[PDB]
Each structure stands twice: as structure tokens, then as C-alpha cells.
Amino acid sequence: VHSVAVIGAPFSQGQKRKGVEHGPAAIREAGLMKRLSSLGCHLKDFGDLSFTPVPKDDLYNNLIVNPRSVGLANQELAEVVSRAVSDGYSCVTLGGDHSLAIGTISGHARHCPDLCVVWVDAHADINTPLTTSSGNLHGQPVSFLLRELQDKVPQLPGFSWIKPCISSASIVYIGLRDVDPPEHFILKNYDIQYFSMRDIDRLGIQKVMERTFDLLIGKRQRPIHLSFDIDAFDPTLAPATGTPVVGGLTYREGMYIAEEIHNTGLLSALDLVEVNPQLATSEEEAKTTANLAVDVIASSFGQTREGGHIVYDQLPTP
Amino acid sequence: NLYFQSVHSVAVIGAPFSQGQKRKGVEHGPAAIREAGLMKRLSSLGCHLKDFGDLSFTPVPKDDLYNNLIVNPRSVGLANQELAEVVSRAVSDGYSCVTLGGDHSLAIGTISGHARCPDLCVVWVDAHADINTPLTTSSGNLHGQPVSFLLRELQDKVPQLPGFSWIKPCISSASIVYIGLRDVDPPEHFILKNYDIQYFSMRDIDRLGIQKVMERTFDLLIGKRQRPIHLSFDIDAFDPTLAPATGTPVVGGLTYREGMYIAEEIHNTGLLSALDLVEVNPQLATSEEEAKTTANLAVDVIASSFGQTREGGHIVYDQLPTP
Amino acid sequence: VHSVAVIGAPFSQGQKRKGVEHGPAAIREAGLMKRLSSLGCHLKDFGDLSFTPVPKDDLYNNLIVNPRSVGLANQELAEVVSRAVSDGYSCVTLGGDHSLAIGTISGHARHCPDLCVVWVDAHADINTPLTTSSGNLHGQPVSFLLRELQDKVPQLPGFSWIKPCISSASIVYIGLRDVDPPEHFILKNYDIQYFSMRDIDRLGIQKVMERTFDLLIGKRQRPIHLSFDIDAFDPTLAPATGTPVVGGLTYREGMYIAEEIHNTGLLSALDLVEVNPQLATSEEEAKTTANLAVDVIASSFGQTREGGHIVYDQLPTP
Ligand SMILES: N[C@H]1CN[C@@](CCCC[B-](O)(O)O)(C(=O)O)C1
Ligand SMILES: N[C@H]1CN[C@@](CCCC[B-](O)(O)O)(C(=O)O)C1
Ligand SMILES: [Mn+2]
Ligand SMILES: [Mn+2]
Ligand SMILES: [Mn+2]
Ligand SMILES: [Mn+2]
Ligand SMILES: [Mn+2]
Ligand SMILES: [Mn+2]
């Protein structure tokens, strides 16, 4: 039995590809609430938030895209996550692009001073506004949150409300395979631990999950924030996403990550982002992606491959 | 070719069961496997072949369902008493029986007939545990219940069904090992855990790897002494991308390589005595290549169980021709 | 900084399936040169070689199809490879069928007699003209190069120029899954080390690469010749090829092989063969295969999944 809050965040201004705002609708349509109900989760649906748009919000310093809208949407999102967490729920946020982790992690840290993050993605999303080549804020969220990067991050319009709330030793990446040269420098230079697809190929997902927990919760229990980008999966399994990168996690590795997070019993918040149903070549590819998003969330709250969720007490005798 | 690493005596049975479940099209299974080229493949491995052909099954006219759930119980139990005899015939003769399905209900017969060597051991490769009792089941389909009738520890929890009186509990808890489990119903999970039935689910394969799983499986079953092996193999243990034409497909299954590995290790013990290849449904395919892939896959599993390998070497080459 | 020469060898006479002659153009259209340039490579593209046609070329011993054509084109290819290798370039040859390895390995061995070969393929390509059942020369290249097999190889027309240049201890196979009975005999009888798909299932690709380098470069550094047949990959990843065989390398395993080759710093020549855009059922299937071929070549010259190939040592500050 878990108390689970669900928040829909139909937001796309962190990137340029249309349709990721329909990700919460597609995940809900795939039967998320019914699947969580069937696991025995006490649910509170906060619905799908309507973000206050910014009319005059264009290209900043000939590089940063929609900073005012991204900053504002995340400020609003942080308040809802804060409420859900302070009300004692494990907070599930449906994206929407990955810039939404600024809001979810900021809102979660308002109640958990010792929170740790497991970031599952093909990308590190740790470019600063000065290292980004694209200027898309979904490839930059971790830079605003990390304490060690405060002196490397300029003040963006709409971002003055953010306070760095996580240290370099409190975030572990899993699934990396498309990292920009400044991002690689940031990971190495600041000793941020990561398990790229190459590390998974060598160690295997079991050792990857063991080492992740040893680094984060080896010394003490801590609330875990699971920030799961659907593009961490191979594009054959998750085609409906904006930045697919070949050679991703298998369905089995993805479920394994989600199961191990459940087994800690320390899961406090989950982000499931970057499901863009409009980018799938067919309705079945949109549905496949959406169903995979439901399986990650369900496994993070007790769904297992061995079918031991619904406890049986007695077998009928003849 | 005149030289082979090993010569096996193998029998092929076409059992087109369909009354074990409700989805039609699984009867065209032994036909699709043969059309792929099974017989030609076993010949190329130097097998002494004995084809028993596609068996004829007649439905019982008055077949009322037991406890208003177990659909077609008389037709399934009657057909398995006879299928057991044909399988017991081949074993006594000194042959290795291979049954083409059809659904997984045919396993009650094959394992009972085989036991008529009593010190045998089973390897159940499936996405499903097929261990529901007639009272714990919810679908009414008998293909999800074969292991309940065969276990000695489950006799007190299984009632006497119409045409199931002939079945005697032959295999004990420590004589069955599952591989590939990913869709286990709550009563099935209670049975496995409480009766200490050793298994290797997809999660276990994810952690240990297919090599360790095979090493551990044999340490359990044939570690005490050399024993005959019954390989019951459901095509749905493989991922639906590889076996798309099947009844109950569950996402996140065995890769082609993992399934060939299981079959190769089974061959390498030299103790394989019986084999089942079920749930091939050519009617459940969206394209011709999807129907052909599942048939070609099923032939690969049986061929690997009798010598076919990735490196070759099954066929023995004497000397190279000189110019 | 790697000095890389690219040679297009639009070679099809080593087999009967037409379209493989379009393999070099397909690889170049998938962005090969742009990808190598971004790695910091100093490039020289020779373009596609125009091989001298042999109009009068009848089958040898009523089996061996187009021998003179295959032999002559390889003799010409070897002169080009020999020159590029002499001029300090790591020579990338784009195929074309795998019979072109006769010319690339022959040409490379002229200036690198201590070379070793890592042969990545579903096939051993080691039938002799006397064991072949197809009569396709792309299934026989290794028999012409292997020193220990000289007494078993008859003199074919247009093949006399070939001087066996590799010993059985200097070649390692990776990916084998479709081996003919005389090929299995050669592998065992001449003690040629191999890692079939079954060896990979057991050891894992990390141990496979460690064992490969222990056998080849355990005693001294040597120039490495990587002969990569795209059909080493599973047909779902590399569909546009002549002889697809199910249960091949995953994308991750293939990148791992290439990344490990790069890490030695010894790569001296690379063949990327059997990309046949005509055999793809759709335009996307041909592009998928060509994109895969580019990833193998880029990974062999530094492309990583971690992003550390480009020098980046100082963050911009606000
Ligand atoms: N080469 C890549 C790595 N860095 C990128 C990330 C965009 C995807 C971010 B997401 O999917 O995780 O949201 C960038 O634009 O900064 C391009
Ligand atoms: N049974 C197979 C093994 N030997 C074959 C190889 C042809 C493929 C060559 B290549 O793709 O590797 O280039 C042969 O024709 O000799 C068929
Ligand atoms: Mn992301
Ligand atoms: Mn991403
Ligand atoms: Mn079954
Ligand atoms: Mn099944
Ligand atoms: Mn080849
Ligand atoms: Mn090949």
C-alpha cells in the first residue's frame, strides 16, 4: 500500500518539437490510474495543470529558447509537487519535456533536505545556459539544481526563484549515450557518477543498480527522486519521443531499474517525461510508447515480473 | 554427409490440440512447423527419424464443463491418456519424443507417459507457470493448469475431474525447474513459493545471465545423479518480436540467443529424453513474414535440442580436398 | 588526431546479389565524412575506385563464379591501400562484398607485415575454392590469405599475385553463427581462435574483447586490421545485407567492439562490407543499415557513447 499523487504537466516549451504536451493525456489513456489502483495504491489525482503562458518570451542572448515560459511553468509545478509531498504522497509527474524536472526536484527538495536523484535517460541534461549548442532548456535542467554549478550558471529571465538543492554526489545517471563535450567535462570534473550504456554493457544492470544504491543510500536512508526520460529506452521500444538515440535500454533493463527502486521502499517522487505521441509513425507506436510509460510507473510502485504483488493467503481445497 | 558428432533416435508427433483454450488457429501449428522444414532439418543432423504423423482427435458430444469454469474437461483428459501411451511406446523403444502443438494442455500426457523412467526431471520454458489448480484458475482454459495434476505435493489441492482419473502424481517438487516466467497469476505465485518449486523468471535471467541459469538448473535437477530430461517448451517464452504468432504473448521475453542457449545446453547434457513445442498460432499473424518467423524459430529450438549449434560442428568433416 | 583515408570499393562479383556496389555511396550519404571530420580526423577520400572489367571470365572448376574479375579488382585495391598505409593514413575501405578483404589485407600487409586481423562477421569466410558449395568468392577470402592453408588452395586465374600474409594465430573471429562443416574443420584443425554468438552469450562482449587483445596484442603492439561485415549484427538492426542470419550482435555489442579497437590506439585499416541498399524492403531499412555502418566506423575512430572524444577543459562563466 502506497499513497500516490499524480500530476499532469502538459508542457513543451523546454524543446522545439510539437506534441510532447499530449504525453500526460496519452499515459492516462494507456490506463495509468486503473493500473495503479489494481496495485493497491491510495490515489490523489491533481489533474493536468494549465500553465500560465508568457506572450512576449523569445530568443535570449541569441541562444536560450522560451526562458520566461520555462521558468514560470516550473515555478507553478514546484508549488503542486511541494503540496503533494507535504500531504504525504509519492509524487508522480507526467511530462511534457524534461525541463519539468527543475520544478519537480525543486518542489520535492522543499520537504526533503537529503533527497537523492536517479536520472534515467539517454542524455545528461546538464548543459548550462552558456554551454548549450541548441539553447533548448530540456537539455539543461540539472545545471540549475546542482550546488557545484551555481557559479557557472547565469541568471535567466523567470529563473530567479530557483535555489540549487542537490550536490554532485546526490545524483546518479543511468543509460547515457548522447552527451555533449561540456556535459562530459561537467560529469568527470565534478565527480558525478554515471552508468552509461557502455557501463551497463560491461557490468550488467544488476551491478549497476547495486552500485547506484551503494553511492546514494549506502550510508543512510534517503527519499529517492526517480527522473525517468522515456528516451532512455531503445527507440524500437519507445519511438514516440523527440530525441531518440539508438542502443538504449531493453524492456527488461527498464523494468529492472523500476523494480529495484520499488525494493528500496524509499521512492518519494517520479517523473515520466518526453512521451510525444504525435512523433510516432502510427497509432500503435504512440500506444506502445504510452504503455511502456505505464509499465515503468507501475513497476516503480510494485508491479513485478514474478507476479507477487497481490498477496494470496489460502488455496481452495476439494 | 556421412559423419556426425552424435546420432539420435527421434520421433515426431503432430498433436493439434485446440480444446485446451478458446482462441482458434493453434491447430495449424504442427502443419506450419513442418512447412518450415523440420523433418529435413532433423535428417541433416544425422537423426534416425520415426514420424508418427498428425494425430486425429475426435470431440466428445456430451462434454459439460466442471464446476462452471473448466471448459471441455472430458476431451482434454481423454486425449492425454492416449498421447501418454504413444510417448511411453517411443521411450521404451529407446527413442526421444518430439510433440508439435497445439496448446500447452498436451503436457499432462507427455510427462506421464515419459514417467512410465520414474527418476526423470522437467525443464519448463514459458512466459507462464501453467500451475493453476482446477479451483485456483480464473480463465477456465486447461493450458494454464498441466503442472497441478503432475505434482505429488499438489494432489490434496487438486480434485478428481471427468476423464482425469488415470493421472498418477509422478514428479516431485525438486524435479521441476521453470525458465522465462513473466506472467504469473497470484495463486500460481503462492504455489511456487510455498511448495519450494525452484524457478528462474525473466528478472532472475536479468541478474544471473542465461549461462548461470543453465548451470544452476542442472546443479538442481541432475546434480544428485544422471537423469532423463523432459523439455516442455512454449514458444511464448520468447519475446513477441521473435515469436509474434502465439496465443498469450507477454512483452520482455527470451532473446533468440537465450532460447538457442537453453536448447544447446540441454543437448550438451546428453540426457534429453522428451520435448514439447507448443503455442504456434499461424492465424494470429499480421503479415506473412510474422507467420514464417515463428515457424522458422520453432524449428531452430528443436534442431538445437538435437545438436544444431551457432559454431556448426554437428556435421563432422573428415579432411579438406587437396588441389 | 587520426589521419584517415576512405576508399570506395563498389565490388559485387564476389557474390550473385546485385546492389552491394551501392554500399559505399549509401554509407557516404548517411553522413560518414561529416561524422569523421567532427572527431578531429584528417580525411582523404579516394572516392569510388573504377575496377578494370574482365568481359571474358568463365567459372573455375564449374563452380567459382567470376574469378578473374574478383582477383584483378583486389590486385588494384591492394595497390591503393598499400599507398594510403605508406602515406600514414588509417585505411577505411567501404564495400562491396567481403571478397574485397583479399585486396585490403594484402595491401595493408605489404607495409605492416606484423598486422593482426579482428574479423567481425556472422560467417568465417574461410571456405577454399575446393570446399565452397555456393561458389561465391565472398565466402572464401580468408583461405587465400592464411599461410597454413596455402597447400589446400589451388591457383585460380587472376589470383596468382596473392601472397598469403596472415598466420592462423594472428586472426580472431567475432560473431560467428553461420559456419559450414569444412569451415568448422579449418577453424579447429588450424587452431584459429573465434568468439561465436554462443561464446558472447557466455563470456559477454567485455571479456570477448579482453581475450581477443590477449591473443593478438598480449606480447607486443601490432597494427590492427578490423574487417567488419555488417551482417555480424542482427538482421533487425542491419536488414540491407545479402546473407542475414538471426541472433546476431546487438547495436551495443557492435559499438563496444569498435570502441575497444579505438582504445588500443592501434587501428591501422578497417573494412566495412556487405551493406546492400537494394535488399532493403523499404527506404528506412536501407538508411538504418547505412546509419549503423557510419556508427561502427565513427566508433572505431573515437566516437563514444560517453562523449569524451572532443577536448573540453574549461567551462564558460557568467
Ligand atoms: N546532443 C544532445 C545532448 N544534449 C542535447 C539534449 C537534448 C535532449 C534532452 B532530453 O531529451 O533529455 O530532454 C541538448 O540540446 O542540449 C542534445
Ligand atoms: N552457409 C554460409 C557460410 N558460408 C557461406 C557464406 C556466404 C556469406 C559471405 B559473407 O557475407 O560473409 O560475405 C558461403 O556461401 O560460402 C554461406
Ligand atoms: Mn531528459
Ligand atoms: Mn533524453
Ligand atoms: Mn505454456
Ligand atoms: Mn505461455
Ligand atoms: Mn563476410
Ligand atoms: Mn557475413
The answer to whether the annotation marks C111 as part of a ligand binding site is: no
Q: Are the C-beta atoms of residues A20 and A117 closer than 8 Å to each other? A: no
Q: Are the C-beta atoms of residues B111 and B275 closer than 8 Å to each other? A: no
Cis bond leading into C96, ω under 30°?
yes
User: Could you identify the residue written with the cell 493497491?
Assistant: A40
Using CB atoms, pick whichever of B210, B300, B310 lies closest to residue C196.
B310
CA separation for the pair C120, C254 (Å, rounded):
9
Q: Enumerate residues 6+ apart whose C-beta is below 8 A from A270.
A: A90, A91, A92, A93, A225, A226, A227, A228, A297, A300
Q: How many CB atoms lie within 10 A of CB B215?
A: 13
Q: Which of A22, A97, A98, A271 is catalytic?
A: A98
CA separation for the pair C296, C303 (Å, rounded):
9
Q: Are the C-beta atoms of residues C6 and C45 closer than 8 Å to each other? A: yes
β-partners of residue B96 are: B10
Tell me the helix, strand and coil percentages in chain B, rounded to 5: 40, 15, 45
Residues of A in contact with B164 (CB under 8 A): none
Q: Which of C22, C108, C138, C262 is catalytic?
A: C138
Cell of C122: 556472422
β-partners of residue B199 are: B178
Map A120-180 to HEC letters.
ECCCCCCCCCCCCCCCCHHHCHHHHHEHHHHHHCCCCCCCCCCCCCECHHHEEEECCCCCC
The answer to whether the annotation marks C199 as part of a ligand binding site is: no
CATH architecture for segment(s) B9-305: 3-Layer(aba) Sandwich (3.40)
C-alpha to C-alpha distances, C39 to B280, C224, C302, C303, nearest whole angstrom:
49, 20, 7, 7
* Mutation choice for C interface testing from B257, B292, B304 by most C CBs within 10 A: B257
CA separation for the pair B17, B29 (Å, rounded):
9
Using CB atoms, pick whichever of C236, C250, C259 lies closest to residue A198.
C259
CA separation for the pair C54, B221 (Å, rounded):
63
Q: How many CB atoms lie within 10 A of CB B110?
A: 27
The answer to whether the annotation marks A313 as part of a ligand binding site is: no
CA separation for the pair A194, A149 (Å, rounded):
17
For ion ligand 5, residues whose CB falls within 5 Å: B 104, 126, 128, 130, 234
CA A171 centroid distance within chain: 12
- Phi and psi at residue B281, in whole multiples of 5°? -125, 90
Which residue from C265, C264, C288 is spatially nearest to C276, judged by alpha carbons? Answer: C288
Q: Enumerate residues 6+ apart whose C-beta is below 8 A from C254.
A: C120, C232, C233, C237, C292, C295, C296
CA A79 centroid distance within chain: 17
CA separation for the pair C11, C18 (Å, rounded):
10
Please name the residues between 33 and 62 in chain C that touch chain B, using a CB distance below 8 Å.
none
Q: Do B190 and A305 touch (CB under 8 A)?
A: no
User: Could you identify the residue written with the cell 482427435?
Assistant: B57
Bridging pattern class, strands B96-100 and B199-200? unpaired
Q: How many CB atoms lie within 10 A of CB C191?
A: 9
Maximum Cα interatomic distance, chain B, rounded to a whole number of Å: 76
Answer whether A201 touches B (CB < 8 Å): no
A111 catalytically annotated = no
Q: How many CB atoms lie within 10 A of CB B155?
A: 13
Q: Check the CA dihedral C129-C134-C140-C143 and report its sign.
A: negative
CA distance A231 to chain C (A): 15
Method: X-ray
Q: Is C37 helix (H, G, I), strand (E, B) or coil?
A: helix
CA distance A309 to chain B (A): 8
Q: Which helix (H) or strand (E) holds A78?
A: helix A67-86
CA separation for the pair C209, A197 (Å, rounded):
17
Q: Is C46 helix (H, G, I), strand (E, B) or coil?
A: strand
Summary count for chain B: helices (H), strands (E)? 10, 8
Cell of A220: 543512510
User: Could you identify the residue written with the cell 525543486?
Assistant: A106
Q: Are the C-beta atoms of residues B31 and B118 closer than 8 Å to each other? A: no
Query: What distance in angstroms lies between residue C68's CA and the mean position of ligand 3's atoms?
Result: 56
Using CB atoms, pick whichever of C153, C176, C247 lies closest to residue B257.
C247
CA separation for the pair C134, A316 (Å, rounded):
63
Q: Which of A57, A231, A253, A271 is catalytic?
A: A231
Please give the DSSP secondary-structure letter assigned to residue C275.
Answer: -
Q: Are the C-beta atoms of residues C91 and C104 closer than 8 Å to each other? A: yes
Q: Enumerate residues 6+ apart whose C-beta is below 8 A from B40.
A: none
Q: Are the C-beta atoms of residues A85 and A109 closer than 8 Å to each other? A: no
What superfamily would CATH give domain C3-300?
Answer: Ureohydrolase domain (3.40.800.10)
Map C153-212 to HEC letters.
CCCCCCCCCCCCCECHHHEEEECCCCCCHHHHHHHHHCCCCEECHHHHHHHCHHHHHHHH
CA angle C23, C29, C33 (to 5 degrees): 100
β-partners of residue C7 are: C93
* Mutation choice for C interface testing from B262, B292, B311 by most C CBs within 10 A: B311
Residue nearest to atom 11 of ligand 2 (CA): C243
Q: Enumerate residues 6+ apart whose C-beta is below 8 A from A99.
A: A11, A13, A14, A15, A70, A74, A137, A138, A140, A141
CA angle B137, B138, B142 (to 5 degrees): 55
Where helices occur in C7-66 by DSSP H, the ranges are: 23-29, 32-38
CA separation for the pair A239, B1 (Å, rounded):
47
Q: Are the C-beta atoms of residues A312 and B189 closer than 8 Å to each other? A: yes
Cell of B298: 520453432
Tell me the helix, strand and coil percentages in chain C, rounded to 5: 40, 15, 40
Closest chain A residue to C38, measured at CA: A181
Q: Is A241 in the pocket of ligand 1 (CB under 6 A)?
A: no
User: Could you identify the residue written with the cell 561524422?
Assistant: C35
Q: Is A98 in the pocket of ligand 1 (CB under 6 A)?
A: yes
Q: Which of C57, C97, C125, C271 is catalytic?
A: C125
The answer to whether the annotation marks C134 as part of a ligand binding site is: yes
A194-212 exposure pattern, b = at least 16 Cβ within 10 A, e = fewer:
bbbbbbbbbbbbbebbebb
Q: Enumerate residues 6+ apart whose C-beta is below 8 A from B262.
A: B123, B125, B179, B210, B214, B254
Q: Annotate A246-261 with DSSP letters as a single string.
A: SS-B-HHHHHHHHHHH
Q: Do C256 and A183 touch (CB under 8 A)?
A: no
Query: What distance in angstroms lies between residue C177's CA and the mean position of ligand 8's atoms?
Result: 9
Q: Are the C-beta atoms of residues B238 and B191 closer than 8 Å to each other? A: no
Residues of B in contact with A259 (CB under 8 A): 203
Resolution, angstroms, 1 dp: 1.9
Query: What distance in angstroms lies between residue A195's CA and the mean position of ligand 8's atoms?
Result: 32
CA A310 centroid distance within chain: 27
CA separation for the pair A312, B235 (Å, rounded):
29
Sheet holding C224-229, edge to edge: C42-48, C3-8, C90-94, C267-273, C224-229, C116-120, C171-174, C194-195
Give binding residues of B for substrate as ranges: 128-132, 139-141, 185, 248, 279
A274 catalytically annotated = yes
Q: Are the C-beta atoms of residues A102 and A113 closer than 8 Å to each other? A: no
CA separation for the pair B144, B162 (Å, rounded):
18
Which residue from C309, C9, C295, C306 is spatially nearest to C138, judged by alpha carbons? Answer: C9
Q: Is A16 in the pocket of ligand 1 (CB under 6 A)?
A: no
A191 catalytically annotated = no
CA separation for the pair C26, C289 (Å, rounded):
9
After which residue numbers is chain A interrupted with C–N beyond 2.5 angstroms? Answer: none
Bridging pattern class, strands A116-120 and B199-200? unpaired
CA separation for the pair A310, A316 (Å, rounded):
17
The answer to whether the annotation marks A127 as part of a ligand binding site is: yes
User: Could you identify the residue written with the cell 526421444?
Assistant: B96
Which residue from B196, B279, B189, B266 is spatially nearest to B240, judged by alpha carbons? Answer: B279
CA separation for the pair B88, B102 (Å, rounded):
20
- Phi and psi at residue B194, in whole multiples of 5°? -70, -40
| Test site for ligand 1: of A16, A70, A134, most ligand atoms within 8 A of the Cβ | A134
Summary count for chain C: helices (H), strands (E)? 10, 8
Answer whether A130 touches C (CB < 8 Å): yes
C-alpha to C-alpha distances, C222 to A262, B13, C112, C292, C300, nearest whole angstrom:
49, 56, 9, 27, 16
Cell of C246: 538471426
User: Could you identify the residue written with the cell 542572448?
Assistant: A61
Answer whether A310 touches B (CB < 8 Å): yes
CA separation for the pair C244, C274 (Å, rounded):
10
CA separation for the pair A148, A134 (Å, rounded):
23
Cis bond leading into A96, ω under 30°?
yes
C-alpha to C-alpha distances, B20 to B72, B106, B160, nearest whole angstrom:
7, 8, 17
Q: Enumerate residues 6+ apart whose C-beta is below 8 A from C242.
A: C15, C17, C20, C97, C231, C274, C276, C279
| Dihedral in degrees, nearest 10, Cα atoms A185, A190, A196, A200 | 150
β-partners of residue B177 are: B123
Q: Do C152 and B322 touch (CB under 8 A)?
A: yes
Bridging pattern class, strands C116-120 and C224-229? parallel
CA distance C123 to chain B (A): 10
Please give the DSSP secondary-structure letter assigned to residue A20.
Answer: G
C231 catalytically annotated = yes
CA C39 centroid distance within chain: 21
Cell of C295: 556508427
CA separation for the pair B150, B82 (Å, rounded):
16
In chain B, where the domains are located: 9-305
| Dihedral in degrees, nearest 10, Cα atoms A246, A251, A253, A255 | 140
Bridging pattern class, strands A116-120 and A224-229? parallel
C-alpha to C-alpha distances, C184 to A1, A219, B92, B269, C291, nearest whole angstrom:
58, 54, 36, 22, 32
CA A132 centroid distance within chain: 20
CA separation for the pair B298, B235 (Å, rounded):
7
Query: What distance in angstroms lies between residue A281's CA and the mean position of ligand 1's atoms?
Result: 22
